[PDB]
UniProtKB/Swiss-Prot annotation:
The chain holds residues 291 to 468 of 470 of the full protein. It comes from Mus musculus (Mouse). Keywords: Cell cycle, Coiled coil, Cytoplasm, Cytoplasmic vesicle, DNA-binding, Metal-binding, Nucleus, Ribonucleoprotein, RNA-binding, Transferase, Ubl conjugation, Ubl conjugation pathway, Zinc, Zinc-finger. The coiled-coil is necessary for the cytoplasmic localization. The RING-type zinc finger is necessary for ubiquitination and for the IRF3-driven interferon beta promoter activity. Interacts with SKP2 and CUL1 in a RING finger-independent manner. The RING-type zinc finger is necessary for ubiquitination of NMI. It is found in: Cytoplasm; Cytoplasmic vesicle, Autophagosome; Nucleus; Cytoplasm, P-body. This is E3 ubiquitin-protein ligase TRIM21. E3 ubiquitin-protein ligase whose activity is dependent on E2 enzymes, UBE2D1, UBE2D2, UBE2E1 and UBE2E2. Forms a ubiquitin ligase complex in cooperation with the E2 UBE2D2 that is used not only for the ubiquitination of USP4 and IKBKB but also for its self-ubiquitination. Component of cullin-RING-based SCF (SKP1-CUL1-F-box protein) E3 ubiquitin-protein ligase complexes such as SCF(SKP2)-like complexes. A TRIM21-containing SCF(SKP2)-like complex is shown to mediate ubiquitination of CDKN1B ('Thr-187' phosphorylated-form), thereby promoting its degradation by the proteasome. One of its GO terms (biological process) is positive regulation of protein binding.
């Protein structure tokens, strides 16, 4: 790809975070805490899963950012509608307002309904996310493998403003404590 030059500075929105998440001072890293993080509840917080949104809202143009996933066992990344459900159980799908990929149990999958198997030869340590609002495209790139394409959602029906979307995953195994980190431009 050659999408780096639509690079945007993403920061995480504390107010949307699940109450067990710990967001760094610079709002560029997030990890799972070992307990509730002593915050009040609010209607924006994802209740059931270790999810958080970016602060930025996009309704036009081309946007690109990169996320470090080094030594994690489980995570979800992509974009979602500003109006996605926050409370209770739900699946990650375009019908529910999400355009995501994930790692789970040694397999990478795209969040279609039902999910799509991804074919990645070089396990990624950093993921690039490209959104073309006007074209209705969300694409995922393997920065560890010279920027190779992972997956493209096309004909997307955004139906509203978009926000960067993150899930650090649970840490039942003790092997998934590592943070998600927004990489420098
Ligand atoms: C399922 C569900 N969880 C909540 N939590 C709250 C606040 C206490 C944040 C309002 C609300 O309507 N719901 N609905
Ligand atoms: C949408 C979604 N569904 C789940 N389910 C679980 C476990 C209960 C399997 C963790 C998680 O992060 N998510 N995110």
């Amino acid at each position: 790809h050659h999408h780096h030059h639509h690079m945007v500075h993403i920061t995480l929105d504390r107010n949307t975070a699940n109450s067990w998440l710990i967001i760094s001072k610079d709002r560029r890293q997030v990890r799972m805490g070992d307990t509730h993080q002593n915050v009040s509840d609010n209607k924006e917080r994802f209740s059931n899963y270790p999810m958080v949104l970016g602060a930025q809202r996009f309704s036009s143009g081309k946007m690109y950012w990169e996320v470090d996933v080094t030594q994690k066992e489980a995570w979800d990344l992509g974009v979602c509608r500003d109006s996605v459900q926050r409370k209770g159980q739900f699946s990650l799908s375009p019908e529910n307002g999400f355009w995501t990929i994930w790692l789970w149990q040694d397999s990478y999958e795209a969040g279609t309904s039902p999910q799509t198997t991804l074919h990645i030869q070089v396990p990624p340590c950093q993921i690039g996310i490209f959104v073309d609002y006007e074209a209705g495209v969300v694409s995922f790139y393997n920065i560890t493998d010279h920027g190779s394409l992972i997956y493209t959602f096309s004909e997307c029906v955004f139906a509203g403003p978009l926000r960067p979307f993150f899930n650090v995953g649970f840490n039942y195994s003790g092997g998934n404590a590592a943070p998600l980190k927004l990489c420098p431009l």
